[PDB]
Amino acid sequence: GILGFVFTL
Amino acid sequence: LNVEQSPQSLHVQEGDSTNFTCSFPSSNFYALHWYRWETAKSPEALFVMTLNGDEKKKGRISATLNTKEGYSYLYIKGSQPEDSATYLCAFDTNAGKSTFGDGTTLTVKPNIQNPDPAVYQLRDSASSAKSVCLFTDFDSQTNVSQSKDDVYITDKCVLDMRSMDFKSNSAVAWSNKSDFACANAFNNSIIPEDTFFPSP
Amino acid sequence: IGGITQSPKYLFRKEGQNVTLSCEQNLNHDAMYWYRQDPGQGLRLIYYSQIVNDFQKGDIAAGYSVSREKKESFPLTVTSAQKNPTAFYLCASSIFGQREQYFGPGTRLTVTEDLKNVFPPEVAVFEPSEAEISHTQKATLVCLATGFYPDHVELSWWVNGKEVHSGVCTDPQPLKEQPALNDSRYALSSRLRVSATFWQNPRNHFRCQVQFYGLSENDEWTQDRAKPVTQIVSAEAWGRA
Amino acid sequence: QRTPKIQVYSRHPAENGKSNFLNCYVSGFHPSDIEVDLLKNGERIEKVEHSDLSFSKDWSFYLLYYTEFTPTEKDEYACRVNHVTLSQPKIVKWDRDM
Amino acid sequence: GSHSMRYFFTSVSRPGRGEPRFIAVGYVDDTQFVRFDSDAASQRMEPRAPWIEQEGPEYWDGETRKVKAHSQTHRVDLGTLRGYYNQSEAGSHTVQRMYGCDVGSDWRFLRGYHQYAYDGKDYIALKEDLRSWTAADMAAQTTKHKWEAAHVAEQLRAYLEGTCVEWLRRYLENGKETLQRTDAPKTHMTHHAVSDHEATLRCWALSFYPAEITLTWQRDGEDQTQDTELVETRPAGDGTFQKWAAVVVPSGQEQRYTCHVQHEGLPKPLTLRWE
């Protein structure tokens, strides 16, 4: 399963 | 997911220390945050905790974290009236939303240096035949109850006269019924034995 | 640092109308959130968005919709389908959907079945008791705001033309005058305490001011009484030796 | 930018008349846009599939293109690859005796 | 042996042709098991190995929501990187991202990874301590400072060291026959003449899994690293892999050379000679 949160560069 | 905070509410006397609990899932922990939520304000973050066994501190407030058993305690030393608030706990896992508990609501009762409990009748400034009763200057052991009638009674309120370093509790009762008098307005509350009832 | 804002502070609508609540943040946050709170209850998550052009339902999404065309904005629509729209609505944001959130100031939304239920407040000031002055050498004024709906009011005390905060206590919330009945009108009380010598000066002017949020121009009004629009209702008293 | 490495081969050892798969593996290239065709006697084969785009530790891309086929003694098979690092399409012949 | 789970994300801008194309794929060891393509009709994370189809609808719903969020984040990043490098809107550009985890033979955490490239070149990577970042250049420094101030690593470390390993363990158990298998190579050798006084010996390994293999040539017992042509290991398409190594020898001396094959599926290395 992949990450459940995301963040921009 | 389930975050459990306890107690729901609690009351402490100004100067006493207090603590409450947050219970959260014991698996897949990513972070815990604590918020303070005052009346007429929004939640404001106090602490974020990710390391088991770490302790955080801000002012008189502090928090601990135990991820193995899924517990965090929040401590307030020498509590002050300004600390009255709802404290929220929130739990992060592998997701983009936190699980919030339902909060613990703290009421810090102020110290009253010289109580002088009394019930005063106030007259309207313009329209005649109108009046209210002011129960005032009692200490914080006194609890005000609602009336058993169609009489209106507000809760205990604290005002602060800053320049005089003076605080006092009060409650307001009013009604337009013929039987309503300040002698009887707060009958449904247990009033201090030496409460002053001014003559005519 | 920037901030996160919501507008307007008070919203009032007739049942069956759609309304959109604004939420804006220049905090450089990618994740935004919508909560509602009922009196006595906790926060309940309606919708969230971790990044522009993406949103996901919370636990109580039925009857709501959102969009996220822009990083800085996350508007919430309360559709007619929502069964209990009346609530306090809070927006929040965080850098990337972990760790602490930042909350806006919140919007209080009230919906009513009938517009004839809207009433402005009546405001009255009651002057200090002479027994109080003699017993304590202090003087308490009481303001009563009574018979208003919705409970969208802001009360302030003005002394000699300047708003004051020292010696003031206002009830945290209005009280329903007919608790079993809904909708019902509300009442609110506040106290201002001053020195006896200060009250005994006839040059001093005291005023209780209630800002009431009610109907706008778009609302239609055919009733007998005056249209209960947004307005300031006030009462005043002067010192007396 | 990096130019593709091209290998043309069968899934199983080739035997005339026996069903098999014909593969074209392109690797080590960048950027990912690439054109790959399988040819029989110089003509493009219609029903050709390919794997999902992935990449190696050094970030270069790789792809497998494949189709079911039955080799014979006379039919010639080849892979044709075009990529921005190539001035013209590159043709690689299937050589079963490699 | 050891195992790994890796996710690979590619986003390519296409000037004048709409939004970037996003493709995501996931692997356990050398076996792919899921994909997402922003251009496909389904708009879902999809299975690419039989054993993952055992997961129920909640798994596929959740992985679809998460990968769609990934897609939009890397779409934004393309625009952000264009600004960091002061590039025009005329060119196509690529953002790549890989993350995942390794476990040892006890299936306990061994190492985690999380790293990015822009246009085929390293951009930023999480270091092995899962606490600090390596910034390729001055533009990556901007990202590094942002992710440091925001504590991204402390949150990533919870995934890479915990959640990632749990999923890998689950997948290894549920895909046992496919993933916990070893296929030893079938080997043989071919012989072609280069010139009248020289020949090529090519050593073959076929039908092996996992992809890790070593082929070396010796001449009279001495390694021939410089004169050995290797080809990239390649997939047969049925879950196994192929590889060969060649050497040019003087004709008539083929007897001096031996090919050596090392693979996890062999009790001992193989030696091959030309017959």
PDB file of N, CA and C in Angstrom, chain A residues 4 6, chain B residues 96-97, chain C residues 30-34 45-59 61-71 73-77 79 91-92, chain E residues 43 61-62 64-73 75:
ATOM      1  N   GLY A   4      -0.432   7.474   2.375  1.00  0.00           N
ATOM      2  CA  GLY A   4      -1.726   8.113   2.515  1.00  0.00           C
ATOM      3  C   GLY A   4      -1.716   9.626   2.624  1.00  0.00           C
ATOM      4  N   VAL A   6       0.340  13.390   1.058  1.00  0.00           N
ATOM      5  CA  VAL A   6       1.090  13.937  -0.065  1.00  0.00           C
ATOM      6  C   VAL A   6       1.581  15.334   0.291  1.00  0.00           C
TER       7      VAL A   6
ATOM      8  N   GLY B  96      -4.639  11.280   5.197  1.00  0.00           N
ATOM      9  CA  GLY B  96      -4.651  12.726   5.121  1.00  0.00           C
ATOM     10  C   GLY B  96      -5.634  13.417   6.042  1.00  0.00           C
ATOM     11  N   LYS B  97      -6.291  12.686   6.942  1.00  0.00           N
ATOM     12  CA  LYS B  97      -7.211  13.273   7.908  1.00  0.00           C
ATOM     13  C   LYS B  97      -6.894  12.745   9.297  1.00  0.00           C
TER      14      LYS B  97
ATOM     15  N   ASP C  30      -1.334  22.909   1.567  1.00  0.00           N
ATOM     16  CA  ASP C  30      -1.970  22.132   0.507  1.00  0.00           C
ATOM     17  C   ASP C  30      -3.236  21.430   0.964  1.00  0.00           C
ATOM     18  N   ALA C  31      -3.335  21.101   2.248  1.00  0.00           N
ATOM     19  CA  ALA C  31      -4.454  20.340   2.778  1.00  0.00           C
ATOM     20  C   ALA C  31      -5.436  21.280   3.465  1.00  0.00           C
ATOM     21  N   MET C  32      -6.725  21.105   3.171  1.00  0.00           N
ATOM     22  CA  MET C  32      -7.777  21.900   3.793  1.00  0.00           C
ATOM     23  C   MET C  32      -8.929  20.987   4.205  1.00  0.00           C
ATOM     24  N   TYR C  33      -9.702  21.451   5.194  1.00  0.00           N
ATOM     25  CA  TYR C  33     -10.685  20.634   5.898  1.00  0.00           C
ATOM     26  C   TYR C  33     -11.934  21.441   6.240  1.00  0.00           C
ATOM     27  N   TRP C  34     -13.079  20.758   6.262  1.00  0.00           N
ATOM     28  CA  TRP C  34     -14.338  21.342   6.713  1.00  0.00           C
ATOM     29  C   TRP C  34     -14.940  20.508   7.833  1.00  0.00           C
ATOM     30  N   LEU C  45     -16.036  15.722  10.693  1.00  0.00           N
ATOM     31  CA  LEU C  45     -15.378  16.037   9.432  1.00  0.00           C
ATOM     32  C   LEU C  45     -16.352  15.860   8.272  1.00  0.00           C
ATOM     33  N   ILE C  46     -16.538  16.921   7.489  1.00  0.00           N
ATOM     34  CA  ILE C  46     -17.453  16.888   6.348  1.00  0.00           C
ATOM     35  C   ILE C  46     -16.730  16.495   5.066  1.00  0.00           C
ATOM     36  N   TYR C  47     -15.627  17.173   4.772  1.00  0.00           N
ATOM     37  CA  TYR C  47     -14.906  17.026   3.516  1.00  0.00           C
ATOM     38  C   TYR C  47     -13.474  17.468   3.761  1.00  0.00           C
ATOM     39  N   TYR C  48     -12.545  16.912   2.982  1.00  0.00           N
ATOM     40  CA  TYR C  48     -11.167  17.381   3.018  1.00  0.00           C
ATOM     41  C   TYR C  48     -10.549  17.272   1.630  1.00  0.00           C
ATOM     42  N   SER C  49      -9.455  18.008   1.442  1.00  0.00           N
ATOM     43  CA  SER C  49      -8.743  18.068   0.170  1.00  0.00           C
ATOM     44  C   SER C  49      -7.257  18.158   0.468  1.00  0.00           C
ATOM     45  N   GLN C  50      -6.488  17.197  -0.030  1.00  0.00           N
ATOM     46  CA  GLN C  50      -5.061  17.165   0.245  1.00  0.00           C
ATOM     47  C   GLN C  50      -4.242  17.968  -0.755  1.00  0.00           C
ATOM     48  N   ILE C  51      -4.845  18.395  -1.864  1.00  0.00           N
ATOM     49  CA  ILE C  51      -4.132  19.029  -2.964  1.00  0.00           C
ATOM     50  C   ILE C  51      -5.171  19.570  -3.939  1.00  0.00           C
ATOM     51  N   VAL C  52      -4.822  20.615  -4.691  1.00  0.00           N
ATOM     52  CA  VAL C  52      -5.734  21.168  -5.689  1.00  0.00           C
ATOM     53  C   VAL C  52      -6.283  20.036  -6.543  1.00  0.00           C
ATOM     54  N   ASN C  53      -7.539  20.183  -6.972  1.00  0.00           N
ATOM     55  CA  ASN C  53      -8.204  19.239  -7.869  1.00  0.00           C
ATOM     56  C   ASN C  53      -8.382  17.860  -7.242  1.00  0.00           C
ATOM     57  N   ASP C  54      -8.493  17.794  -5.921  1.00  0.00           N
ATOM     58  CA  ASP C  54      -8.743  16.526  -5.246  1.00  0.00           C
ATOM     59  C   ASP C  54      -9.519  16.800  -3.968  1.00  0.00           C
ATOM     60  N   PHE C  55     -10.606  16.065  -3.753  1.00  0.00           N
ATOM     61  CA  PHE C  55     -11.311  16.164  -2.484  1.00  0.00           C
ATOM     62  C   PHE C  55     -11.895  14.803  -2.142  1.00  0.00           C
ATOM     63  N   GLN C  56     -12.100  14.574  -0.849  1.00  0.00           N
ATOM     64  CA  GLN C  56     -12.595  13.294  -0.365  1.00  0.00           C
ATOM     65  C   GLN C  56     -13.593  13.527   0.758  1.00  0.00           C
ATOM     66  N   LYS C  57     -14.611  12.679   0.796  1.00  0.00           N
ATOM     67  CA  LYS C  57     -15.662  12.797   1.791  1.00  0.00           C
ATOM     68  C   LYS C  57     -15.124  12.509   3.186  1.00  0.00           C
ATOM     69  N   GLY C  58     -15.678  13.208   4.165  1.00  0.00           N
ATOM     70  CA  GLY C  58     -15.459  12.896   5.563  1.00  0.00           C
ATOM     71  C   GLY C  58     -16.497  11.918   6.060  1.00  0.00           C
ATOM     72  N   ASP C  59     -16.802  11.995   7.356  1.00  0.00           N
ATOM     73  CA  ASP C  59     -17.782  11.089   7.944  1.00  0.00           C
ATOM     74  C   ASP C  59     -19.223  11.540   7.733  1.00  0.00           C
ATOM     75  N   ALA C  61     -20.645  13.627   4.915  1.00  0.00           N
ATOM     76  CA  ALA C  61     -20.619  14.391   3.679  1.00  0.00           C
ATOM     77  C   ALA C  61     -21.987  14.526   3.027  1.00  0.00           C
ATOM     78  N   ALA C  62     -22.938  13.650   3.349  1.00  0.00           N
ATOM     79  CA  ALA C  62     -24.229  13.672   2.674  1.00  0.00           C
ATOM     80  C   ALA C  62     -24.846  15.061   2.760  1.00  0.00           C
ATOM     81  N   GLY C  63     -25.289  15.579   1.613  1.00  0.00           N
ATOM     82  CA  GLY C  63     -25.911  16.883   1.543  1.00  0.00           C
ATOM     83  C   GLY C  63     -24.955  18.034   1.315  1.00  0.00           C
ATOM     84  N   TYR C  64     -23.649  17.778   1.309  1.00  0.00           N
ATOM     85  CA  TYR C  64     -22.633  18.798   1.097  1.00  0.00           C
ATOM     86  C   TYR C  64     -21.873  18.523  -0.193  1.00  0.00           C
ATOM     87  N   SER C  65     -21.212  19.563  -0.695  1.00  0.00           N
ATOM     88  CA  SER C  65     -20.313  19.427  -1.830  1.00  0.00           C
ATOM     89  C   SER C  65     -19.216  20.468  -1.697  1.00  0.00           C
ATOM     90  N   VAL C  66     -18.046  20.150  -2.247  1.00  0.00           N
ATOM     91  CA  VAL C  66     -16.904  21.053  -2.245  1.00  0.00           C
ATOM     92  C   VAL C  66     -16.282  21.070  -3.633  1.00  0.00           C
ATOM     93  N   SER C  67     -15.398  22.043  -3.835  1.00  0.00           N
ATOM     94  CA  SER C  67     -14.528  22.107  -4.996  1.00  0.00           C
ATOM     95  C   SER C  67     -13.164  22.582  -4.523  1.00  0.00           C
ATOM     96  N   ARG C  68     -12.132  22.271  -5.308  1.00  0.00           N
ATOM     97  CA  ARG C  68     -10.782  22.707  -4.974  1.00  0.00           C
ATOM     98  C   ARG C  68     -10.060  23.003  -6.287  1.00  0.00           C
ATOM     99  N   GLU C  69     -10.545  24.023  -6.990  1.00  0.00           N
ATOM    100  CA  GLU C  69      -9.897  24.464  -8.212  1.00  0.00           C
ATOM    101  C   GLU C  69      -8.609  25.227  -7.936  1.00  0.00           C
ATOM    102  N   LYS C  70      -8.468  25.804  -6.740  1.00  0.00           N
ATOM    103  CA  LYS C  70      -7.339  26.652  -6.388  1.00  0.00           C
ATOM    104  C   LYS C  70      -6.804  26.245  -5.029  1.00  0.00           C
ATOM    105  N   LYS C  71      -5.480  26.323  -4.888  1.00  0.00           N
ATOM    106  CA  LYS C  71      -4.838  25.965  -3.627  1.00  0.00           C
ATOM    107  C   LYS C  71      -5.380  26.792  -2.469  1.00  0.00           C
ATOM    108  N   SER C  73      -8.284  28.181  -1.814  1.00  0.00           N
ATOM    109  CA  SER C  73      -9.714  28.273  -1.534  1.00  0.00           C
ATOM    110  C   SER C  73     -10.361  26.895  -1.506  1.00  0.00           C
ATOM    111  N   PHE C  74     -11.316  26.720  -0.592  1.00  0.00           N
ATOM    112  CA  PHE C  74     -12.003  25.439  -0.404  1.00  0.00           C
ATOM    113  C   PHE C  74     -13.443  25.719  -0.012  1.00  0.00           C
ATOM    114  N   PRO C  75     -14.302  26.036  -0.979  1.00  0.00           N
ATOM    115  CA  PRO C  75     -15.672  26.448  -0.643  1.00  0.00           C
ATOM    116  C   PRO C  75     -16.586  25.256  -0.395  1.00  0.00           C
ATOM    117  N   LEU C  76     -17.439  25.392   0.617  1.00  0.00           N
ATOM    118  CA  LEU C  76     -18.378  24.353   1.025  1.00  0.00           C
ATOM    119  C   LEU C  76     -19.793  24.779   0.679  1.00  0.00           C
ATOM    120  N   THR C  77     -20.500  23.944  -0.077  1.00  0.00           N
ATOM    121  CA  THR C  77     -21.899  24.194  -0.386  1.00  0.00           C
ATOM    122  C   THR C  77     -22.778  23.302   0.483  1.00  0.00           C
ATOM    123  N   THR C  79     -26.221  21.939   0.393  1.00  0.00           N
ATOM    124  CA  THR C  79     -27.331  21.796  -0.538  1.00  0.00           C
ATOM    125  C   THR C  79     -28.646  21.633   0.222  1.00  0.00           C
ATOM    126  N   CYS C  91     -13.443  25.781   9.125  1.00  0.00           N
ATOM    127  CA  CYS C  91     -12.460  25.414   8.118  1.00  0.00           C
ATOM    128  C   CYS C  91     -11.076  25.358   8.756  1.00  0.00           C
ATOM    129  N   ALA C  92     -10.202  24.511   8.206  1.00  0.00           N
ATOM    130  CA  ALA C  92      -8.851  24.374   8.741  1.00  0.00           C
ATOM    131  C   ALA C  92      -7.900  23.979   7.622  1.00  0.00           C
TER     132      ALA C  92
ATOM    133  N   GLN E  43      -9.572   5.005 -14.401  1.00  0.00           N
ATOM    134  CA  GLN E  43      -9.320   5.954 -13.318  1.00  0.00           C
ATOM    135  C   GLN E  43      -9.226   5.231 -11.977  1.00  0.00           C
ATOM    136  N   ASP E  61     -10.541   0.736  -3.455  1.00  0.00           N
ATOM    137  CA  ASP E  61     -11.040   2.095  -3.263  1.00  0.00           C
ATOM    138  C   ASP E  61      -9.975   2.977  -2.628  1.00  0.00           C
ATOM    139  N   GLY E  62      -9.330   2.477  -1.574  1.00  0.00           N
ATOM    140  CA  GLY E  62      -8.384   3.304  -0.846  1.00  0.00           C
ATOM    141  C   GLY E  62      -7.131   3.590  -1.651  1.00  0.00           C
ATOM    142  N   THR E  64      -6.952   3.716  -4.869  1.00  0.00           N
ATOM    143  CA  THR E  64      -7.315   4.647  -5.935  1.00  0.00           C
ATOM    144  C   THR E  64      -7.333   6.091  -5.428  1.00  0.00           C
ATOM    145  N   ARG E  65      -7.960   6.335  -4.271  1.00  0.00           N
ATOM    146  CA  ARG E  65      -7.988   7.687  -3.712  1.00  0.00           C
ATOM    147  C   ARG E  65      -6.584   8.219  -3.481  1.00  0.00           C
ATOM    148  N   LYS E  66      -5.708   7.378  -2.940  1.00  0.00           N
ATOM    149  CA  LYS E  66      -4.370   7.831  -2.596  1.00  0.00           C
ATOM    150  C   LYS E  66      -3.555   8.136  -3.843  1.00  0.00           C
ATOM    151  N   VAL E  67      -3.653   7.285  -4.870  1.00  0.00           N
ATOM    152  CA  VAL E  67      -2.812   7.480  -6.051  1.00  0.00           C
ATOM    153  C   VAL E  67      -3.302   8.677  -6.862  1.00  0.00           C
ATOM    154  N   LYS E  68      -4.602   8.959  -6.827  1.00  0.00           N
ATOM    155  CA  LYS E  68      -5.128  10.168  -7.460  1.00  0.00           C
ATOM    156  C   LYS E  68      -4.574  11.426  -6.798  1.00  0.00           C
ATOM    157  N   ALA E  69      -4.412  11.400  -5.473  1.00  0.00           N
ATOM    158  CA  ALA E  69      -3.765  12.504  -4.775  1.00  0.00           C
ATOM    159  C   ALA E  69      -2.297  12.623  -5.175  1.00  0.00           C
ATOM    160  N   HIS E  70      -1.590  11.491  -5.289  1.00  0.00           N
ATOM    161  CA  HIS E  70      -0.224  11.511  -5.816  1.00  0.00           C
ATOM    162  C   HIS E  70      -0.179  12.175  -7.184  1.00  0.00           C
ATOM    163  N   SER E  71      -1.122  11.808  -8.053  1.00  0.00           N
ATOM    164  CA  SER E  71      -1.121  12.308  -9.424  1.00  0.00           C
ATOM    165  C   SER E  71      -1.156  13.834  -9.458  1.00  0.00           C
ATOM    166  N   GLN E  72      -2.041  14.431  -8.661  1.00  0.00           N
ATOM    167  CA  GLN E  72      -2.198  15.880  -8.665  1.00  0.00           C
ATOM    168  C   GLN E  72      -1.010  16.580  -8.024  1.00  0.00           C
ATOM    169  N   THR E  73      -0.399  15.966  -7.010  1.00  0.00           N
ATOM    170  CA  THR E  73       0.769  16.564  -6.379  1.00  0.00           C
ATOM    171  C   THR E  73       1.927  16.669  -7.364  1.00  0.00           C
ATOM    172  N   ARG E  75       1.682  16.691 -10.599  1.00  0.00           N
ATOM    173  CA  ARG E  75       1.285  17.695 -11.587  1.00  0.00           C
ATOM    174  C   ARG E  75       1.694  19.095 -11.134  1.00  0.00           C
TER     175      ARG E  75
END
